[PDB]
Amino acid sequence: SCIQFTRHASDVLLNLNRLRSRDILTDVVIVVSREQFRAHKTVLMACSGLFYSIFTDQLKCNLSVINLDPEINPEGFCILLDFMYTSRLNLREGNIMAVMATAMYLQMEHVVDTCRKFIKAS
């Protein structure tokens, strides 16, 4: 009966990334050390178990700044945030361990698994 649009989800995601880039309706700043990352809570909750728990916690849900562990690699976090909004995970010899560890912290187990397959590749 029904019609399914195969590019719809990727087009929504493209436009969400364009909203992030223009800073339109971004409602949280994630802080890693002194580095600040602007985002939409809902996109974060849709990609990460950590962010889900944080923004359904009544003590934290209304905060505009969330501070993650300052021991987290900011390049690792930046790679993963770009990934949430793009589907593209840019992995390098030099950044891969940091990304894997950051993905564990964010409870994005499937990204970890993809990093493990990547390591098995070479």
Added chain:
Amino acid sequence: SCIQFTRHASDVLLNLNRLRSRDILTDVVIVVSREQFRAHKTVLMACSGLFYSIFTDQLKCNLSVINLDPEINPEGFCILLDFMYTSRLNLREGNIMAVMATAMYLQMEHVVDTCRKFIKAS
């Protein structure tokens, strides 16, 4: 050298709809005369030129309740909101004209284009 996750956009979209279903971080009620639909502004702005204009307008950006034209068919809107959050457009002979007219009003020409292909095959 990038890895691209081909199911990522649709998995994000599934989770956004689960968030809509559980009423989590919904920040707007769209009103069609007296019918009500809870949504996330950013999904609406990612899908429709009309909603983009509404939520970037300084008079309306901080409203928790938004009126659409109260004469639009509420079934037509409801089919389209579900489409925004699912990729699935459920077209029957009984609703096609209401969906098409509503899509024009939401500035979703590619959906209108599809309803025209549906008219051409039916």
Added chain:
Amino acid sequence: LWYTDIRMSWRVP
């Protein structure tokens, strides 16, 4: 279930 690959016409500025 029929599929279409049509691209979304709306692009955020």
Added chain:
Amino acid sequence: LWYTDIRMSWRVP
């Protein structure tokens, strides 16, 4: 560019 179809492990309850 390399593609994977792996499914997201995170699911909103």
